[PDB]
């Protein structure tokens, strides 16, 4: 396979100025006509012109209203279209085409194709070539004039992007609509939709133009009472864009429309974002909690995109973190003041040191701008995402909101209507520097390392205190392991956001302060600090590195209660349990490896019990963060800790560390679970479809958090209590009582009662299937034949598939069973998937990315099954690409 270089970018000899497409949408096929206004540009040399096109079958092709002829003056191998130069005129000239295309057999959901009732296109990034030929790169940018025709009992909604600026109807029961969309776009941010659609609707005002813009949002019509959320999620997103950047929407219109097959959480097409309706509809009733913070986020960064995507837009693929990286930091700021709960932040934080440091540390470790590919369906990762937006984040808490927004507003004045590169952002930040620094000869070059160089960087601590001097000394070293990227690491610039809280009365000793490490280590030292402080390192977690902050757990424990920031309380509770878990971890394997007839664990430390106790009982503190203290760190986040990982002794460690804890506290458990419920399960506003209360939420978290705590313990009766949980109106707590039974003879009584509640919203019994996929049951491997033969069957919604086999793979006993029955399960559905969806295929794949982190029987067992997947003969591209990165082949 072809790889691409990001050295290697040169622009088109070729330039298409306009498109004119007529898109006839017939039962058994559809037909796509193509007018293409094209030139010669001044780089041209002579070449053939060459189209992409994948998967088109060709009616005819024409230059100038003459026809081409195959073999003699074009070859179509079904990826490339190649006419030869001898036959491309040298100015102006029209290339035209018709195709027919096959939107219900198209299962790979991109181009074209049907979800369900509704046909609707997804040309990101490499799928517009799928509905006709183009130079299909995102620097082509051109004019649309684009005609839709369908039949009109069927297709009764047909949308586009820029004006509607005809209707007509067609002889034999059809009707078209053109839409003309002036303002040049890449071809990646066409849209198309035609279904049966319904809509709610409203008007917005900008802030300073006073432009009315109308915004619809659409869905199937048993569905459309479920929009409510996602418009005010709109309204909200518009606001902040408006009251942080100063940045108003330019069009007349804007569009969301929900379908129910799709392969992420959405798509920003001008004026026309298409989403999954997992990231779209809601309603109080046949919603859990989840899905009202996932749809204001996924609506919030489609929306974002209209500036940092669509109006400031790419050179090239590989530079594609300047508009994800930066539209999720925008989505996150967004969020954060949306939700106003220190969990938004610290969720963030948790996802990006879980899931992207260890992709970070696998063989498929990029940066976050990569010098090469081979699959650009492949390029969206967690990397160029989470630590492209934390990245970003970067640039804000060096400069500050004041110099940020003005750099910000300098990128965006300059590149309004262009195309712009990483450095392009970098270079807009560093005015912003020289400003704050005051002085022009400040840079940000080292900065542009955050870009080039791949691996998480680990910053580690030592301190000195001089009780005579009232001097105290942070002493910083920063180390990058080398990889397959950089032989040699480079010193970063890493900012840290510090305080120091004098341990005696819980208060800051300095003010606000961001340390600029630059250098390999550096030493930091202040005066005037009349008592040994305990430093609070990383507030806000203020870079994406691994932070050893070499503290005791007595001063962890310190911090923990008397800290302003929530995320160095959350870390300081962090490190404390990664002490104890590496520990036991430790104990229980060599009991294990010597066969021990006898041996001890080392028990949690009593004062961080008492600690958590003091936090739980404090009617003042925050039910979010509560639930995060309660819980141990993510299996994945740990397995970035441990050589050789044993599964199973990991397993162990868990389950000895909640058992000492719940030991000392669980009647505490019961108590809060009992006095929380007023609150948190109020009623008051549950038919009120616009009202949602996070801080509610986050109580809801922490008694379904606290109820499973209590049943694996098996607290005296509990079942009463989760009996009660299956009758509330709140599927999130309806839902928490079938997964928390599992450890009682009640759990096929809840599942049959809970399957009822969900089977007749698509989108809630998708997360009923959730549930049983991740419920902690023995009999696990025959309820997933149960799903798959009453449920899931041949369903191929990659919403349903991953429903039922995502949840299941973070079942730390099950999945990876010492047999391989868990891998051999994976493989086989990856593999059955592969067939019609490798995107989905792909991610499918994700608990395969740890395979070299664990215990040499289950490195191979999973080895084994992904050169089993490799070696099917009928493997697509995309799959065999990713799994030959990800097995070092
Ligand atoms: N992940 C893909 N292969 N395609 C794909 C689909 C949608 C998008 C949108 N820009 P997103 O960042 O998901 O909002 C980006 C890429
Ligand atoms: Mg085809
Ligand atoms: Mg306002
Ligand atoms: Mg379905
Ligand atoms: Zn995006």
Redesign the pocket.
Known sequence: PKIHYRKDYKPSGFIINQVTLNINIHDQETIVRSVLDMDISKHNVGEDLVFDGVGLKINEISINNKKLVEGEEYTYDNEFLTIFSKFVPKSKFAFSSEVIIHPETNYAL?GLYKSKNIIVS?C??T?FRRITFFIDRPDMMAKYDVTVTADKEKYPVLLSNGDKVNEFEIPGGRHGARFNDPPLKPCYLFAVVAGDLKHLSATYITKYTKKKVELYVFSEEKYVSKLQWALECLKKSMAFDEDYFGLEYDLSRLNLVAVSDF??????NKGLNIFNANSLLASKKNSIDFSYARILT?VG??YF?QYT?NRVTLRDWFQLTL??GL??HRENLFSEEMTKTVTTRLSHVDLLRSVQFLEDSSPLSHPIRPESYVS?????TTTV?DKGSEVMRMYLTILGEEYYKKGFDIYIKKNDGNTATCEDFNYAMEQAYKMKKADNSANLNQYLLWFSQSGTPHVSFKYNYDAEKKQYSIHVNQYTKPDENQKEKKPLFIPISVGLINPENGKEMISQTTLELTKESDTFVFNNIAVKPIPSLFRGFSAPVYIEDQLTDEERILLLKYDSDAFVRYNSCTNIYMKQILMNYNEFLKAKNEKLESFQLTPVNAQFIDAIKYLLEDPHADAGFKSYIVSLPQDRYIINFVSNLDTDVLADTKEYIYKQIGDKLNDVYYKMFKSLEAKADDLTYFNDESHVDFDQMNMRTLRNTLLSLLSKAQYPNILNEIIEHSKSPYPSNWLTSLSVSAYFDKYFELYDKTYKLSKDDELLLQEWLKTVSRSDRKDIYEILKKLENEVLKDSKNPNDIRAVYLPFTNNLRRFHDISGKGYKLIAEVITKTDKFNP?VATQLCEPFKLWNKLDTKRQELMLNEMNTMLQEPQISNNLKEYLLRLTNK
């Open positions: 991109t997804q990101e990034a799928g392969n992420v959480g959405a798509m920003e996924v960064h489609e995109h995507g508009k994800e539209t999720v650009m369906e492949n390029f969206y995402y995107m």
